[PDB]
Write a protein that binds this ligand. Structure first.
Ligand SMILES: Cc1cc(C)c2c(O)cc(C(=O)O)nc2c1
Ligand SMILES: N[C@@H](CCC(=O)O)C(=O)O
Lengths: 277, 277
């Protein structure tokens, strides 16, 4: 069967979620239907699927893949975690949906790394990313590997920096720099928006996060005060996650590379990711 | 059971130098105090008789090979591609030349070189996840401001600002392929040079104002410091990957080892060693 369950996650400008027109219940323009399971209350796990509309860089990717690889899909937004974390030996988030066969593929701002690749297959990367550092213009740091992060109690006063927990960035820091990691927990941010506010108002000195998102955000910061250092550490990409041994992986890879070869990836990047700063 | 590794002379990924009089490689040191690791690579020196000789190979890709071989416990021997090409498909039953042809024929078991990942090649061979991002940029005399591929002096060309690439190079071929680059292509066509070296002096000699070429090579050429400089955002991005045949038993581990190396800073160390100036 070629009608596929596909999971995604909101993260602008890669995946943007909009409310559907109540009078039509049809997604229009450059959007596609995507549903989200929403609980009725906090007593039980009873819920309903809500019909929404999704668009963005990764959604344009999905629509193109749908056409050249020839499949249809039922796209849903993950509600069990976010991108993917292994918790008590069980993967949650988009990665978990694929691992546990709830979704044939995961499409979104999903970072390829080694531990994920052990449990899912990734397509070729289709957006460059890795780990960057955002600061207010003026602040001097070199990148993740900087000693100002590695030994934060060297340097006076102590540098204030954090990430959004539970994604590939925290996973990388936890593995590579144990001291830096336990020091950052104090500055964990609930989300990118909170972090950007914390930076602009001097509550934070640096925000360590996915490069593709930080670059996009720097590109449209009001007043162009927020900038990314240098640079990217641990360069990898966003990839489409597929179940291990998936029959779809080969055509998906070939189609993505076709898009590169026909100039379409370059076009999509300038379309969705262009900054004014 | 030594894996036959094929590579190509392409600085700063692979330097190729003659052996000394005793047939050994000159002991040298990197920008940090580290000894340069060198391997003997056999291959042609210079219509030509292609007489094969032991030569010294080193650089980014050689450091990578050494790490991979250690990590995955394989032995290897390195040779330079006999026809000196990366690999395209040509006829007179179409047949791949260059490293692509050697890999497919069994003359090599793995391609370790800055081999651009693309659709045409991926139909035939397996690429690893990228060990290095690839893109084009622009080389100009210091003081010249070009924004990137979308700069009005490129989009709307005149003889007041002359830009070009190398005739029949991979870049030339790519540009001819895109209809949206047509107007840009007719300008370049009239000015393309015979070799990169002939394009670059022309930039030094104010005979050509902008040279469009591989980004890694252009930063390297610019690293002389500095009548020349690179400008603008990178464009037409892809990656360089290790190439292997479809049924290689090493392919998943090669990819995982490359992700591991990006994630633990090994690849940044290589960047610092060979591509940071
Ligand atoms: C670092 C570098 C530089 C150049 C100029 C390349 C090229 O022309 C082709 C290819 C190719 O066909 O793979 N790779 C290159 C890699
Ligand atoms: N893209 C990341 C989420 C953000 C981050 O942790 O940098 C991931 O797939 O986990």
């Amino acid at each position: 069967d070629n009608h596929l369950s596909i999971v995604t996650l909101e993260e602008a400008p890669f995946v943007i979620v909009e409310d559907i027109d109540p009078l039509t219940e049809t997604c229009v323009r450059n959007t596609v239907p995507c549903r989200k399971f929403v609980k009725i209350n906090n007593s039980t796990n009873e819920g309903m699927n809500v019909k929404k509309c999704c668009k963005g860089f990764c959604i344009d990717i999905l629509k193109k893949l749908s056409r050249t690889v020839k499949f249809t899909y039922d796209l849903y937004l993950v509600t069990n975690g976010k991108h993917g974390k292994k918790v008590n030996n069980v993967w949650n988030g988009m990665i978990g949906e694929v691992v546990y066969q709830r979704a044939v593929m995961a499409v979104g701002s999903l970072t390829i790394n080694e531990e994920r690749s052990e449990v899912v297959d990734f397509s070729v990367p289709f957006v460059e990313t890795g780990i960057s550092v955002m600061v207010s213009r003026g602040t001097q740091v070199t990148g993740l590997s900087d000693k100002k992060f590695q030994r934060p109690h060297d340097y006076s006063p102590p540098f204030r920096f954090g990430t959004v927990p539970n994604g590939s960035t925290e996973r990388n820091i936890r593995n590579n720099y144990p001291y830096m990691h336990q020091y950052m927990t104090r500055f964990n941010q609930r989300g990118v928006e909170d972090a950007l506010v914390s930076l602009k108002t001097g509550k934070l000195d640096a925000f360590i996060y996915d490069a593709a998102v930080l670059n996009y955000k720097a590109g449209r910061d009001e007043g162009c005060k927020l900038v990314t250092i240098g640079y990217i550490f641990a360069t990898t990409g966003y990839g489409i996650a597929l179940q291990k041994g998936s029959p779809w992986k080969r055509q998906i890879d070939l189609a993505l590379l076709q898009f590169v070869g026909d100039g379409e990836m370059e076009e999509l990047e300038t379309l969705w990711l262009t900054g004014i700063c | 059971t030594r894996l036959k590794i094929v590579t190509i002379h392409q600085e700063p990924f692979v330097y190729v130098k003659p052996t000394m009089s005793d047939g050994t490689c000159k002991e040298e040191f990197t920008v940090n105090g580290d000894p340069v690791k060198k391997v003997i690579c056999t291959g042609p020196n210079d219509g030509s008789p292609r007489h094969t000789v032991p030569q010294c190979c080193y650089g980014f890709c050689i450091d990578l090979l050494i790490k991979l071989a250690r990590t995955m416990n394989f032995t290897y021997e390195v040779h330079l591609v006999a026809d000196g090409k990366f690999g395209t498909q040509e006829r007179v039953k179409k047949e791949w030349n260059g490293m692509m042809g050697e890999l497919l024929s069994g003359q090599a078991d793995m391609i370790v070189a800055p081999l651009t990942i693309n659709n045409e090649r991926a139909q035939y061979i397996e690429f690893s996840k990228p060990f290095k991002y690839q893109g084009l940029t622009i080389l100009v005399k210091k003081g010249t401001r070009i924004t990137g591929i979308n700069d009005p002096r490129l989009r709307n060309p005149s003889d007041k600002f002359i830009y070009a690439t190398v005739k029949q190079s991979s870049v030339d071929i790519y540009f001819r392929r895109q209809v949206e680059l047509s107007t840009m292509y007719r300008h370049m066509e009239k000015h393309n040079y015979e070799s990169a070296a002939e394009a670059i002096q022309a930039v030094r000699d104010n005979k050509l104002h902008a040279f469009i070429w591989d980004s890694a090579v252009l930063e390297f050429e610019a690293s002389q410091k500095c009548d020349l400089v690179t400008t603008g955002e990178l464009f037409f991005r892809s990656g360089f990957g290790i190439g292997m045949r479809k049924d290689s038993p090493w392919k998943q581990n090669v990819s995982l080892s490359i992700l591991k190396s990006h994630e633990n800073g090994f690849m940044e160390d290589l960047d610092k060693t060979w591509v940071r100036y």
